[PDB]
Design a protein around this ligand. Structure first.
Ligand code: NA
Length: 110
């Protein structure tokens, strides 16, 4: 199986303006739009961009990060590898790990 892409989830103050900006930046409209969130599936560069409405803030912040893989089998291998590395993990197919500075990561399947 074995390929993957980065999930970049941004907490944004202005969702509507952000959708417009990122459509222009990556040259494609969003794949999915709902009240309070929108996501882009970008081929080049390979990226899953998630825009999360945060009307409470006044500046774009990092919401969370992720590795998006092809199937559940890849998640398992990732989950086991992270555990062997000595990283404290929580595994459901999903696995969550948090960096030293508090940035949340998730390895999940599309
Ligand atoms: Na990527």
């Amino acid at each position: 199986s074995h390929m993957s892409r980065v999930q970049l989830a941004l907490r944004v103050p202005d969702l509507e303006a952000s959708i417009g900006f990122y459509s222009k930046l990556f040259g494609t409209g969003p794949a999915k739009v709902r009240p309070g969130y929108a996501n882009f599936a970008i081929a080049e560069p390979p990226l899953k961009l998630v825009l999360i409405e945060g009307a409470g803030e006044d500046a774009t912040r990092l919401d969370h990060l992720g590795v998006e893989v092809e199937d559940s089998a890849q998640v398992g291998h990732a989950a086991r590898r992270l555990k062997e590395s000595g990283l404290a993990t929580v595994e459901e197919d999903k696995v969550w790990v948090t960096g030293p500075g508090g940035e949340p990561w998730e390895v999940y399947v599309v």
